[PDB]
From a paper:
They are nucleated from MT organizing centers by the evolutionarily conserved γ-tubulin ring complex (γTuRC). S. cerevisiae γTuRC is built from a helical repeat of seven ‘V’-shaped copies of the tetrameric γ-tubulin small complex (γTuSC), composed of Spc97/GCP2 (SPB component 97/γ-tubulin complex 2) and Spc98/GCP3 subunits each bound to a γ-tubulin molecule.
Three-dimensional (3D) classification of the MT subtomogram volumes against 11–16 PF reference structures revealed that the native MT lattice contains almost exclusively 13 PFs (97%) consistent with γTuRC presenting 13 γ-tubulin molecules for MT nucleation. The native yeast MT lattice is in a partially compacted state compared to structures of yeast MT reconstituted in vitro, suggesting that the native nucleotide state as well as MAPs result in a well-defined MT lattice spacing in cells.
Numbering used by the authors:
A (entry chain Z), B (entry chain Q): 1 to 427
C (entry chain E): 1 to 440
Amino acid sequence: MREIIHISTGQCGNQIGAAFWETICGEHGLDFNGTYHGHDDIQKERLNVYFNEASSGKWVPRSINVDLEPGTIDAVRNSAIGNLFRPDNYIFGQSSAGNVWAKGHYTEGAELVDSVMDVIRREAEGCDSLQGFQITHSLGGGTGSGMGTLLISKIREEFPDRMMATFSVLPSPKTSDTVVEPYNATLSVHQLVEHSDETFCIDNEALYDICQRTLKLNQPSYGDLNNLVSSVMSGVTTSLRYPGQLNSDLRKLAVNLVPFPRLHFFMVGYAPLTAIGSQSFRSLTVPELTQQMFDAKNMMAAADPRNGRYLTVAAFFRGKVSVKEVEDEMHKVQSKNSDYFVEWIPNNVQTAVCSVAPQGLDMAATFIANSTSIQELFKRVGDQFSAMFKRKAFLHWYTSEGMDELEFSEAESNMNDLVSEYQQYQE
Amino acid sequence: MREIIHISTGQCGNQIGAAFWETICGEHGLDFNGTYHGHDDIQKERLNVYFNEASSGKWVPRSINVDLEPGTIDAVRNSAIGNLFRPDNYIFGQSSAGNVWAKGHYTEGAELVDSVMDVIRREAEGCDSLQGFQITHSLGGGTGSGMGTLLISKIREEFPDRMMATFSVLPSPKTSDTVVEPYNATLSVHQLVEHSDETFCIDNEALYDICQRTLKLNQPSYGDLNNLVSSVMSGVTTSLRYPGQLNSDLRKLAVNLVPFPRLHFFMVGYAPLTAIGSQSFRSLTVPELTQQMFDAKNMMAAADPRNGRYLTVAAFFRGKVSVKEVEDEMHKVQSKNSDYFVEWIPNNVQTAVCSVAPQGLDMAATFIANSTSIQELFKRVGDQFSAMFKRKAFLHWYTSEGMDELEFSEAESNMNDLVSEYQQYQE
Amino acid sequence: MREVISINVGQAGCQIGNACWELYSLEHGIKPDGHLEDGLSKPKGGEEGFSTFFHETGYGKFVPRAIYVDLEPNVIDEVRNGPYKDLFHPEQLISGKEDAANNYARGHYTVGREILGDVLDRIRKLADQCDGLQGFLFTHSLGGGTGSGLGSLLLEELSAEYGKKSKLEFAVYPAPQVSTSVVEPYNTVLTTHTTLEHADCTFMVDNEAIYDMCKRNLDIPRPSFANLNNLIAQVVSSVTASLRFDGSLNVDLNEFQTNLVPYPRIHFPLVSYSPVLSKSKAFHESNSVSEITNACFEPGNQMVKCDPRDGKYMATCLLYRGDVVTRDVQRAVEQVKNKKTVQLVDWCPTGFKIGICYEPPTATPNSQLATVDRAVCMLSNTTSIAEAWKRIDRKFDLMYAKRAFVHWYVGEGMEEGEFTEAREDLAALERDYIEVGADS
């Protein structure tokens, strides 16, 4: 019960999935021409999770990438490693979803998705130990928010016993690429909360801030950000695919980290956040990774942690680590950071140990937690709606297809309910 | 309880701290490429005071250098040994404090100092046996006097159990680089007396006099003066970092040398004061060092010792010394110099023994004492104020930001109180 | 009632202890690492003693039973990086890591007593390890605040836990001419009251007198602290003369407090060791015990900067090692009485405790003391140090006029009442010193 099928959709989702693919093929070791490079055994049975054995000792991915623009796959098969992708994995159409929610999946997005569901079924009986479903998409993007939720609907319909993992990128409330980006984001979360079991809060501006703070990056490139998020995504499952003291699974995240399926929003933090030029001057140890974990400028929600409080926090450690260091540092943080932990657990902690070291580093970890700071982003988006959308400007583009104000009022009620849940559970 | 964090600020403070760094790395032995040269054990556990173990057996300093002009660090990393400095230690901004007190820390100096306080905290939990705080700055300098006192305020706020050591350079009452240098000096000592536990009186003109008397130096260079003051600064802590008959600590200075926290001004004397061309003609012994200690032209206050009287004197000896020589010479000085000692201790003496010999010499010592000659400098500065500043010329530059005459009157009352304390304790 | 536990506090006390265990290894034939090398006698353990100071390991090793307590880790590191590592148990070396004073500012207060619990537990476990308990040996410096404070705290703690064992304290007193640090008189007198209320027998040693005899008797131009440690090491190890070696008339530890101390009153005897000569003066002197006793009566050999002949007589003990004759020593003491020495009291009225030991006197190779066939250790509770405490108290009055230190002393939690109580206690002690000889 380990195999994972990686679903990719949206403009940003394709890049994130591709970068995740190069990170995977580099962390376990596999050249693009079909040459075995695992060392020695544990890197062979665990690659069945993402790849399947083809003829002549060839390994090919089991991943359905879907997008209405076919220009991204050209920059995948001829670019860096995507040559393993079988031609049937390319499900693309013409020409775009319109960068909106009314045309994303309501009328035209429901045509080829039947074939998508059929190929998902055929991969399902082609798979033996299907475990989870990984989706990468954009919350405000037309394609990702458009058919992503409807794919979630089908994957719930056909698999009532399989949980769903979503990693949508949340647009910042201060950057507006288009006037209807938060509109599409909220029209997507209208069904995301009713169809998903857990999700991660990803903000590009937080990535820019961490690049200009620690990385000192001069050129704003989405490739480095994809590399970082893909390293985080690999790290959250290294515990499952590499045994340790306590292996962690997505269902274990649902049981422990999630307080109830209604509240499933998480902020992501990664460590170590070091760049070239500081590698010969730091000692990479568990305590340093810990102060980098609870540092207020290291998560990518991105909100303020010490102005609110946490509800439950988790640690997913990687590499050769002793049991005493991590628990001693956890005693230290529980002694000094006791005020911001909830007074009913009372020890907000979930630990997981990974054996192999991260690629390009020695010791690393990921941060998953629940705080009361996401309701601030929700009320910011709601206030943006209550300000801009009361004029009913450019709103006919969606009501032309049969949209009613009842759906928007229900979405506002949903975000009010989410805020109230974030206040139960007071800040 | 030994580790020391060296804080550096101001134009002169950066040079003094750098020179102290080369003197330290030469006295214990450490090449700039990361090569171990200690001999053998005692030079290894004692370097944890200033350096921390990095990866691959590398030692890096734990010192926060701050200055509003970024040109000094270029003459540090590319010049003589400063390459060990980690890039995060460089906290610099733009562009200057204005060489004044109104803009030093009152309005614009309080912006980046929050980040300075945060990095001090992170070094605090990064440190295990934090002992004291060393600061080098200029009393009349705009930057050093500007945010130096406010850094002292924070270091008192966050560490109520840690004493503070200050080594500000006191400008002479006869040299005026700028018309407001004593003004900034007094605006700094307005809070220095209320926030510091001990301080040293350093005058550059005394250094010039001792260079033209014994050194016969032809070129006036600040580097030699920095070397001398850094040798003195190393000598005052050789007792702590090298065991002897009586190890001395800064808290021991506070207990013994300081009569009460209000009076904490000390004059500094060093021995031997010998130059090239006299090394083959003198016998370097304890008695000769003693006559060089009480010599009226060897301290750097610089005032007249035999026209006033001492309140308490201390000796900090270094090198292979027998217990009998030092005590016999102390009997001699107490017999011949009994008139100038206070009649209530009555034996003004504090002794400390160091094991290792000073670098570049065989036997050396430092002089720390309390006399009634500092009130003369204070009244000289006060008379300079009462003469120049009654015209209110160029005084609007500070009152433009919200300065009141109440602060200046309170500073005058403070210096009157210091004089009265220096007369209790009569001269 | 078999074993004696020794505790050293302060750097000076640790150096003295190092020297004294070096000697103990020297005469009893233990190599600087132990086991063995090899065993000598017959009697050195077996038969008992040892064990008296060295634990008898079942494997055949010899382990000193001492506890090194100090807040300065440098001394513990110096002990652990030398040959002393094979003699002291790792748990007995209590290494401190907190340095805020040296040390009486915080030593005699709440800062020290959260560590004293572990020390008491360790010493209780060590006492349970051995069969019986006879007395305790203390080696601390009253100059260094660590010694004063921690030693006094241990004094009240172990007087409370048992209250029935002999308490021997070898306290190093500050030089009465000059003091190395100003706070040493406080470190001494603020614990003199605890010493008065919680001690059975205290020995006074002065570094100035040792340096004087090193300059004069040893002809050493630059005496070292190691020489002082070795000299007082022989002084301690000759007490402690018949407890480890056979003798015609052995002296018991309880006998000291039975004869020298007949009251609930003054119990602070002086000590003296003689002959004191160098390796070059051993080719001209073969004196008898009379001149050795005369040298003991000399002020320079009394380890106190005072005149012992100007005081009044008190019960004294004479311990003899090597080849001695009882008729000779009786003749010598009768001559001393004939010379009209210190005024004899009417309460004893004349008591000369004589101790004879078979073992020859021993000397340290690190010291310049020549081996002699006969030596005298003299113990007397003479009232001649009264002017010494009087001089210390005059210093106290002159530096208490301004009080000079009450700022910090009150700021940590004390007040001038304690200083006044110590002052009046010292005055009462001096008055008792005068009266005990004035009654006769």
